[model samples]
Target: STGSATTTPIDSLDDAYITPVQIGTPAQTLNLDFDTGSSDLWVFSSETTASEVDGQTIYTPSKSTTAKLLSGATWSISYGDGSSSSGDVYTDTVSVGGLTVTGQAVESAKKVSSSFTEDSTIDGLLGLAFSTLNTVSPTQQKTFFDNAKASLDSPVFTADLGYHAPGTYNFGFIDTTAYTGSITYTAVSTKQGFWEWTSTGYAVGSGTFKSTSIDGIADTGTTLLYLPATVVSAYWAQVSGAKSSSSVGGYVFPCSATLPSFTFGVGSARIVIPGDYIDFGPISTGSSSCFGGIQSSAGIGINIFGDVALKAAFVVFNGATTPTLGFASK
Candidate 1:
């Protein structure tokens, strides 16, 4: 059976998408940000300190009869954006949609960064990357997907992200009806536990496509596209008023300026990002300037094909065989 769910947007725009998930014996539901950038199923729980608790819902392991504390097990994780969370570990029944994985490792958060605490919409994060990246101490734990794979008919999951609209994430089955075109399959390099792939090249609008390979990860949690410093500079060059502003930081341009679409090569297939989507809203309210969605991934070692790029197509994370990634236009 397909374990499917439509992710709901809690913000004004598609800043982040959350899906309902149940954890524990009696099945307490929590709306979690399904993050492909990380590999820890951590959540705000009763273990969280009072001061760190904001408006977010907390998970209670004690109420779940099937829940068991992993003796001396602990976990701590920090994201690229500086947001972090740390907590103890609990093994319990976890379910997403109709798929259930008994005794799945659930990280109960005891502390969280200001970024997470202030975000009242999401209760926690459900990591979708490989289990090799799990942060549980003493012994790394398997992710919910990994545990459920043996019971699944197909070891595959597809992410259908929409632009400021509802999107469905289906596990164990590829719903071909969700995508428009044929999926272009590419080999993935999972040595880093990320869905990393190399794009043949990219072009700025109608410009000539270069053969320069761009290595990046498909990160759903990230809201913007991040490429090499030189590549990002070239893309913004096409926009007349675009500049790397020191005040606004990163890259910014006049909201009224004409922006050019960006296209990236996925093997033989090309996925195009519309120009209007590149203008990531306004930098500030009533401000004439807007932030560029495609920016430089200087500090980070690899580029990120974030939500801005992922939403342009339907993405399949195939765990079958060589673990290839399939992309199709939505």
Candidate 2:
């Protein structure tokens, strides 16, 4: 079987991509962040603290006839940005697009950090990374993709993130028409439980391509592109008013500056990120300086090819015996 879902950017800056997911028998729909960087399908539910609940929709398991308590099962997850959420677990029928998975583990949030409580656009996260990264204790649970893989025509999924527009997430099959030219397949190292791959190299604007291997993960949950400090420094240097500001915690530059395009190699094929995408947004409202969508991974430890890079192309997460990632220009 095959399934497809539409994902939309929540804000003008395309801060995060959200997709509607149906949970339980009554089919309570919630807007969730389809995050490929983590492996837990969690949501804001009836168990969540009252004060933490904002304008986001909450999942009421009691109302769903298909919901079953996973007694004693619990989960907790913390992100690199310091945001976190935790709760008990429940097994229920979860549906994405038209695909349905019975007994899918749904982590119900009991506690959430300030970052999550304040983001009214996102109710929870649907992790697409490997199940090995699941946070459920006692017995780690499988992700929605993992649970549905066996029933799919192909054990694969695709991500096509858009820039300020609705994108797509397809399961079990790839839409050949969605991309141009041919796809370049690369080996993925799931040892770290991530869709990690090595990039051939990169080029700033029309500069010469630097032939170097850079290890990173394809993370849809992340909003920006993070690379080695050396590479980040080189790209920023090309911008006239660009500077690494301690106050802003990353690179910032004049909002009016003419930005250059960024290119990265997926084998011999190169994907170019338009300059406009790099000017993330203003550091603050009405501020003349803007934050950069590309930042250094020095502090983060691992480099990430987040939404900034993913939005420029079509991505495939192939879950064969030996997992692999495929990239193609769109």
Candidate 3:
């Protein structure tokens, strides 16, 4: 991991093409989700079904004295996991850390089953992946950041998470703890607003693994970095004793300290996914080691670096005043 992280501004907003959203009540917040592949702000509701909760947090809307409802729109989303939920269209005044974001769009999925209901502490997700995939219209809902962006010293949003767990995903200031001092920014896709990149290969501490570069899309919905075969193979080469796992699974390493310290090169910015993160988890197969969930499919057309990888760096998917993507906080 780089000792210092930082952020840099690359562009400004043009109202002609920009989308205007409201960031009102700060108390009506939801966990941020940066889903490039999908658009929606979904969460557990008071009316949710208990059987679907299993063991997840369904944030009660009642807490927000100013919460509202769409009353006309409703939804249910399904990911690659096949797990799903059915809920109604709900509006609420929520808080993110402290401020209130009023009229924020949310889906009251009372019947979520699968990854959403079986995951960690998050009750529901606030999809900040892209404004294009929003559950509510700019006509109906606004984000907490919308109102605060102008007030921000810098027009930026930070999603802080360590390569592992228990870290701050900042939305404004670029944490200077993880970046390597230099940056080469890229533009965001307008069709589907996601922070993306074109990577050619992996270069770690010493070895240079020659691999084909692919489109690297930042997707919060995905938990794994969907590396291409050549790229995935290149990374495993660094692991002391990594071997082929399964298509649905990426690669498995013997849970030994011998794992490789691999990093992905996005343009000029090198995002490292430490071996500790790869092996620190509970699921292990070979050599009692933490094996990576390296799955091979027909192959991911684009390389999707999920939170599993982005959490390692202080990433910001800024779509406020412009449509281009930028990297900062070195």
lDDT of 2 by residue, 215-276 (tens): 99999999999999999999999999899999999999999998999999999989999998
* Model 1 regions lying over 4 Å from their true place: none
lDDT of 3 by residue, 179-284 (tens): 6565456666655445665665666546765554666776655666667676667677766777775642556666654555567666666666665545534353
The stretch of ten residues in a row with the least summed lDDT in candidate 2 is 275-284
Q: Residue 68 in model 2: shift from native, Å? A: 0.2
Clashing pairs in 2: none
Return the top candidate by lDDT: 2
Which candidate should be chosen as best, given TM-score against the real structure? 2
lDDT of 1 at 313: 89
The alpha-carbon deviation from the true structure for residue 193 of candidate 2, after best TM-score superposition, in angstroms, is 0.2
Error of 3 at 68 (Å): 1.9
Candidate 3 regions with alpha-carbon error over 4 angstroms: 1-38, 135-153, 173-180, 209-212, 238-241, 280-289, 293-300, 327-330
Cα error, residue 154 of model 2, in Å, equals 0.9
